[PDB]
Design an enzyme around this catalytic site. Structure first.
Site, PDB file in Angstrom:
ATOM      1  N   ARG F  54     122.247  -9.680 -48.282  1.00 30.67           N
ATOM      2  CA  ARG F  54     123.112 -10.818 -48.032  1.00 30.67           C
ATOM      3  C   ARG F  54     122.305 -12.072 -47.718  1.00 30.67           C
ATOM      4  O   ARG F  54     122.552 -13.123 -48.302  1.00 30.67           O
ATOM      5  CB  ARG F  54     124.091 -10.514 -46.898  1.00 30.67           C
ATOM      6  CG  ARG F  54     125.260 -11.488 -46.810  1.00 30.67           C
ATOM      7  CD  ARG F  54     126.255 -11.090 -45.711  1.00 30.67           C
ATOM      8  NE  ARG F  54     126.693  -9.700 -45.848  1.00 30.67           N
ATOM      9  CZ  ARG F  54     126.222  -8.696 -45.112  1.00 30.67           C
ATOM     10  NH1 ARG F  54     125.307  -8.932 -44.178  1.00 30.67           N
ATOM     11  NH2 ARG F  54     126.661  -7.459 -45.307  1.00 30.67           N
ATOM     12  N   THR F  55     121.343 -11.960 -46.805  1.00 36.49           N
ATOM     13  CA  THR F  55     120.509 -13.104 -46.424  1.00 36.49           C
ATOM     14  C   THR F  55     119.613 -13.596 -47.572  1.00 36.49           C
ATOM     15  O   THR F  55     119.430 -14.803 -47.751  1.00 36.49           O
ATOM     16  CB  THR F  55     119.642 -12.787 -45.172  1.00 36.49           C
ATOM     17  OG1 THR F  55     120.506 -12.524 -44.052  1.00 36.49           O
ATOM     18  CG2 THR F  55     118.730 -13.966 -44.827  1.00 36.49           C
ATOM     19  N   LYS F  84     100.271  -1.407 -47.227  1.00 34.35           N
ATOM     20  CA  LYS F  84      98.836  -1.230 -47.012  1.00 34.35           C
ATOM     21  C   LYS F  84      98.330  -1.426 -45.587  1.00 34.35           C
ATOM     22  O   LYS F  84      99.088  -1.734 -44.662  1.00 34.35           O
ATOM     23  CB  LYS F  84      98.029  -2.124 -47.959  1.00 34.35           C
ATOM     24  CG  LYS F  84      98.836  -3.166 -48.713  1.00 34.35           C
ATOM     25  CD  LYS F  84      97.982  -3.778 -49.809  1.00 34.35           C
ATOM     26  CE  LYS F  84      98.816  -4.529 -50.828  1.00 34.35           C
ATOM     27  NZ  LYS F  84      98.049  -4.736 -52.085  1.00 34.35           N
ATOM     28  N   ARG F 105     111.330 -12.601 -44.228  1.00 29.73           N
ATOM     29  CA  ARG F 105     111.999 -11.705 -43.285  1.00 29.73           C
ATOM     30  C   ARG F 105     111.098 -10.477 -43.063  1.00 29.73           C
ATOM     31  O   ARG F 105     110.501  -9.961 -44.015  1.00 29.73           O
ATOM     32  CB  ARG F 105     113.340 -11.252 -43.871  1.00 29.73           C
ATOM     33  CG  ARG F 105     114.055 -10.146 -43.091  1.00 29.73           C
ATOM     34  CD  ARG F 105     115.339 -10.684 -42.559  1.00 29.73           C
ATOM     35  NE  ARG F 105     116.317  -9.682 -42.145  1.00 29.73           N
ATOM     36  CZ  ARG F 105     117.553 -10.001 -41.775  1.00 29.73           C
ATOM     37  NH1 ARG F 105     117.925 -11.284 -41.786  1.00 29.73           N
ATOM     38  NH2 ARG F 105     118.408  -9.057 -41.396  1.00 29.73           N
ATOM     39  N   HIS F 134     116.333 -15.855 -35.749  1.00 28.97           N
ATOM     40  CA  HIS F 134     116.986 -15.910 -37.061  1.00 28.97           C
ATOM     41  C   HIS F 134     117.606 -17.307 -37.168  1.00 28.97           C
ATOM     42  O   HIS F 134     118.836 -17.464 -37.157  1.00 28.97           O
ATOM     43  CB  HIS F 134     118.057 -14.811 -37.167  1.00 28.97           C
ATOM     44  CG  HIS F 134     118.575 -14.591 -38.560  1.00 28.97           C
ATOM     45  ND1 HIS F 134     118.216 -15.386 -39.627  1.00 28.97           N
ATOM     46  CD2 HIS F 134     119.433 -13.661 -39.047  1.00 28.97           C
ATOM     47  CE1 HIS F 134     118.830 -14.952 -40.719  1.00 28.97           C
ATOM     48  NE2 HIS F 134     119.573 -13.910 -40.393  1.00 28.97           N
TER      49      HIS F 134
END
Ligand SMILES: O=c1ccn([C@@H]2O[C@H](COP(=O)(O)OP(=O)(O)OP(=O)(O)O)[C@@H](O)[C@H]2O)c(=O)[nH]1
Ligand SMILES: O=c1ccn([C@@H]2O[C@H](COP(=O)(O)OP(=O)(O)OP(=O)(O)O)[C@@H](O)[C@H]2O)c(=O)[nH]1
Ligand SMILES: Nc1ccn([C@H]2C[C@H](O)[C@@H](COP(=O)(O)OP(=O)(O)OP(=O)(O)O)O2)c(=O)n1
Ligand SMILES: Nc1ccn([C@H]2C[C@H](O)[C@@H](COP(=O)(O)OP(=O)(O)OP(=O)(O)O)O2)c(=O)n1
Ligand SMILES: [Mg+2]
Ligand SMILES: [Mg+2]
Ligand SMILES: [Zn+2]
Ligand SMILES: [Zn+2]
EC number: 2.1.3.2
Lengths: 310, 148, 310, 148, 310, 310
Positions: F54-55, F84, F105, F134
């Site tokens: 959604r974001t 990694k 994110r 956020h």
């Protein structure tokens, strides 16, 4: 026959003080005088729908110490044909035609109780059902308390850690509340407090309990210090970093401990008890684990044998 | 005068609260019979203002069956009828257990996926009723259990 | 020695009517008089290359009821060193140096037969090889039929469900066709019909069979109603919704059933048999499962012991 | 006669088959109202032998609402009542569409556990009714859809 | 506005013959004369709840060829877990505030139709919903037939393979049935025959069709040979081995083929079409795939651009 | 240049009231008059180390609405393996040679802040860093409140649900506390209460807040009802069952609501908001999501374009 003969062992709530004393007396006797052929020719199902290696090994070892044979499974998210689709009811209906007793651990609460409704004359022993009961952990805890303290009444018991989500501390508290004069110290972050319904139960029986911010408040008085693991996966990492301080035990914390005092922990311990505690005479969590063998032996013996020839 | 006329013989459950009559019929499978049943919903009432009313002919309820009404119609009056006579009245008493009809609110309870009847231990508290599931052994307010 | 001594048990096609009768007689005898030490000091490999919890538990329980020891594995897509790379041939060449018998279940057809070529003097018992054989399921089915009906000849047998892909119904039909006067009713969606090669086999022996759209056509005549599971994962969901009606059994369907009639099902049942059937005297699928213990015991005893002391 | 007395104003659904009256009450949420409702179940019938009967005062049904009865009560008589007199009689006929009450038997259909009302096109085919899901576009015998 | 402006494209059964012709005519135009800026400043969602690389790349390429921007995802990773308890309704209610059109593929039948009820004025194009519809596959198929045959009427069309479970052949059959004089040949194993409801639809419209056991029976009169994949996973491998010869095509099978005849396949063709077919002038499956671009452009253009393309 | 030109957007606590107003004013402008070529020839990295469909779609749509190009990835597949031993520092040092801005994110708190120390002159925008910040969610929330209420001062704001663990409510509370006269109502189970440090911050600024056990207590005076998700995974299911009634909203709860009152939810709302709320004029969660586009455009424009947008 003995009062536990052919009985299901599902909940500490179903066991009277006399029942508990009988299991504990039987465990002491088998510990002193093993009976490696008592359950010869019995076949027991070890059904771990939910995996639990420590509990399963303990239980299966108890089965072999009495000479019984063992079949079973331990389940990740998968084993085989029926499961996923077939009901637990049908699974038990089948297995109970094979074996003389069923030991079962399961992720859903009530799973062992449901099994009793489909197992016919086959006794079901609950090795853990979700966040509900784990009665054999409680029996091994009580056996360890009785063995080290010489009694289950008039004790000072501190419980430390995640008291909100620990099914083993809830059960141990209920069981100890069947005895007289016990006093409780609860040491837990507000977010992990002992639940109100447990406190209400103690209040109704006039059993004393108090909250404390640190174990030092009560260390000098403690007979049993029962530590639990923090379910950190429920907690925010920063929050978990902030709580652990008052609930981590080190050897230095034991300086004014009574000579009789034992530290118990159902395990795994990872953060809660520093390794330096291990060498002290108070560390008893490994001995506690070893006692699982005798408590579980006593249960199998009582359930599957009419009369206790000693 | 009576919209739902008097019966010769059977059971009349009176003083059921509005919006509970149909619920009783569903939950307790009252209509699964060949006996004549007559029902009034949203009838006027002196005691209650408005009410539901269920009549089942040639059928009778045990005290325990009447007690199973307690949670839904605590002020119900169960009338036993014979020869057009009320030969007995009783009120539900909160029973010790409630089977079949309630659903455990614990989503992780084994009761949900499985061929078993729900079962609860009943105990009265100061301002509600506590209901403890036979299976998961969790205890909930009746307000939680009845809400589904 | 007895005719099954040290023989491989791979296919119902390899077993004569006399062989089948011998296993069944032996199963009845052990059921009435257990011999818990018959296979003392024997070690049996329980090799489930393909996982099957119900079958494995049943087999291992049978091993313990005769006093034998058990080693083995059950394999997801993975266990350990050799597999993935090493041949089944090499795996058997090794294990057959360890144990006195090998019980094996495997995803590929012919796997048990190949094992016999590398097991030396170690008998192989096929617990299932892909869509080919499952002879011990067939033996437990036959034992249950014989025990409840008192015979394996002159029966009326209905088979219901997925007759196309059910290896157990194919095998049961072949086995029953070794006996006289049996009559078959096949009740299945056209898409899941009993295969032609089975019908051809019955035709060549002059064995009567007929198709029916619903079990009500023949319920009054049926001695054994053998239900199978629909492999719904092969079917379209809408199609599966459309078929199930004529192949789902409820208690009400049994109103004109003969007193002797038994409902059998190799399990799991999920949709095929409503739980209300369970209480009727006709429900026999759990008893059938319990009979797996005696059929499997009889097989192990016959294969691993020269002479049947009873 | 009349165990269940005449009403002044509203709708009377007569000639409902036995064991269908309660089903109509459930499916069409008929008791979710404050209007007075009177009901007779397993009543004797000249035409039917026995029947169910539903009266809902101050409440009227559209022709399309009457048609939704067709699958369950094909011979139903829906009576309109005003000032104690029967003003209209209608019988249901097959609708072209049935919403809300049926459940698509296709287990992979998106309709399950989504916030939509079920919907089926209705197609007559000599004997049976064919029902086609608005969503998965699969078509089933009405017997299959009614089975769950 | 054009007939398809701002319309949802969900099912072949909602599209008239005139609609199909309009899409095809638009496709021919864009193929002859590209309009790389037609959908400049449109943002289109490529929502592949079920992964489908070939279909997704085709669709996204079409969006770019008209100059639109693309956002999207491909799942089939969150297959029934991780994939939230959030409804598809909510997902669409959100995404429809972001974009100008939604192209979606989903494992459940009816998903695209449900989407339209929550998308407001945002058109949804169905890229496949379980075993239900796949209208843009049918549109590229029809375009390919029309291009190579000069018409969509009076054709001899053979369909081969899994006619029972192929959503693509069901839809192509429905579409061609909107035109006149078409003649169908259905070549499939009995277990995978064209469903009765398709046959009923053809009979109702007076359209001729016949069943044939092999391709060779009709090779000389077919204009289109539409092959489909037989997925092994539904069949038993031995069953697959036994019937595969009749739905497999190789170059030598084409000896008597009409000069105009084209071989189509929605792909992948791995088993059904031998690579030796690739070099014949009849092989048209890759050109068919190429036409996906023009069919999908035409649809996007018609749905998102008010005026007809010139 | 504008105050936010070439600035990193990491934390609500680094943004002044003037910054927030500037973003909101820019968002209103772009909503009223689109600038689809403003960021033509910019390439932006959409780096979703933790997946968030959604974001991510919201952010990428915003990039396209301003005409920018997008490259990126979404992980949460390489969750702690495959992923990694290469540092985030190195990943950012590399990616910052490719692109003009980084939207990221990440599951660890502080990740975006660390990124800025290796991104050189490339701005990073924080799309969420563990349980920390956020900020673009908060900006779309504030824009939505401002739009529907006409102001960000003197509001009655209720926040309901998991106030303890919701990063989004913490940030919205901090943001609203930069404005004057706001009044807060916190409705949460005791186990999930707004943290003390947020309360201390409000007390320090002289801002009024009160705790309430249910929504009904304050429904008549609230201008914004901001609901959050209670994730079950932290709670015991029985505990979840017991408290859920107080943080669940349905249409009937709104009877006495002010005419201006809007219900907000950062989504998903699956348990907390009943679908019957959707049709009320108070339901504003989807419009809220839509405003994500304008808030994120405004931010991208301000950070990447020197001059204010007109
Ligand atoms: O058997 C009955 C009882 C009652 N009713 C209908 O219910 C309404 C009330 O009739 P009641 O007879 O029940 O009056 P009541 O004063 O006894 O009421 P309560 O306080 O006990 O509740 C009247 O409209 C009557 O027609 C019936 O139709 N049948
Ligand atoms: O309004 C009514 C109608 C009927 N009934 C009760 O139903 C029974 C039948 O009463 P009816 O009035 O319906 O006789 P009928 O011949 O018209 O029946 P049909 O063929 O039309 O079906 C009688 O026992 C009567 O008391 C009511 O109680 N109320
Ligand atoms: N032959 C009968 C007699 C009574 N009833 C019903 C009518 C009432 O609803 C209920 C009780 O009858 P009562 O005569 O006792 O009515 P009351 O109003 O006096 O009793 P209560 O105080 O309980 O309301 O039984 C009935 O259906 N048939
Ligand atoms: N004030 C009224 C009048 C009628 N009815 C009911 C009684 C019947 O059940 C139904 C129809 O009334 P009719 O008088 O028409 O009864 P019929 O038997 O004559 O009609 P039908 O042939 O349809 O059964 O409506 C009612 O409840 N209230
Ligand atoms: Mg009265
Ligand atoms: Mg009449
Ligand atoms: Zn429960
Ligand atoms: Zn459907």
């Amino acid at each position: 026959a003995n009062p536990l003969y052919q009985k299901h062992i599902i909940s500490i709530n179903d066991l009277s003080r006399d029942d508990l004393n009988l299991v504990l007396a039987t465990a002491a006797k088998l510990k002193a005088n093993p009976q490696p052929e008592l359950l010869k020719h019995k076949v027991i199902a070890s059904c771990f729908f939910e995996a639990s290696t420590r509990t399963r090994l303990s239980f299966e070892t108890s089965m072999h110490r009495l000479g019984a044979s063992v079949v079973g499974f331990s389940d990740s998210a998968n084993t085989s044909l029926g499961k996923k689709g077939e009901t637990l009811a049908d699974t038990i209906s089948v297995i109970s035609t094979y074996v003389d007793a069923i030991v079962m651990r399961h992720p859903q609460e009530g799973a062992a109780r449901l099994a009793t409704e489909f197992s016919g004359n086959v006794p079901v022993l609950n090795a853990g059902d979700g966040s509900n009961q784990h009665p054999t952990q409680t029996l091994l805890d009580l056996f360890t308390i009785q063995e080290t303290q010489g009694r289950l009444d008039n004790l000072h018991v501190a419980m430390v850690g995640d008291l909100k989500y620990g099914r083993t501390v809830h059960s141990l508290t209920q069981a100890l509340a069947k005895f007289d004069g016990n006093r409780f110290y609860f040491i837990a972050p507000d977010a992990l407090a002992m639940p109100q319904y447990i406190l209400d139960m103690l209040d109704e029986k006039g059993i004393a309990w108090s909250l404390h911010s640190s174990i030092e408040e009560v260390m000098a008085e403690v007979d049993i210090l029962y530590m639990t693991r923090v379910q950190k996966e429920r907690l925010d990492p920063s929050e978990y970093a902030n709580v652990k301080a008052q609930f981590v035990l080190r050897a230095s914390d034991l300086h004014n401990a009574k000579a009789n005092m034992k530290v118990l922990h159902p395990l795994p311990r990872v953060d809660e008890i520093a390794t330096d505690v291990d060498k002290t005479p108070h560390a008893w969590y490994f001995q506690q684990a070893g006692n699982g063998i005798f408590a579980r032996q006593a249960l199998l013996a009582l359930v599957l044998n009419r009369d206790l020839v000693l | 005068k009576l919209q739902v006329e008097a019966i010769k013989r059977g059971t009349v459950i009176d003083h059921i609260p509005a919006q509970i009559g149909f619920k009783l019929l569903s939950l307790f499978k009252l209509t699964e019979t060949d006996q004549r049943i007559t029902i009034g919903l949203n009838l006027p009432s002196g005691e209650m203002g408005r009410k539901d009313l269920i009549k089942i002919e040639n059928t009778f309820l045990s005290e325990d069956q009447v007690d199973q009404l307690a949670l839904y119609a605590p002020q119900a009056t169960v009338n036993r009828i014979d020869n057009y006579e009320v030969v007995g009245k009783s009120r539900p008493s909160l029973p010790e257990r409630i089977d079949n009809v309630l659903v455990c609110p614990n989503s992780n309870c084994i009761s949900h996926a499985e061929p078993v009847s729900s079962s609860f231990a009943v105990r009265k508290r100061a301002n509600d009723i506590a209901l403890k599931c036979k299976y998961c052994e969790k205890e909930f307010s009746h307000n939680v259990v009845l809400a589904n």
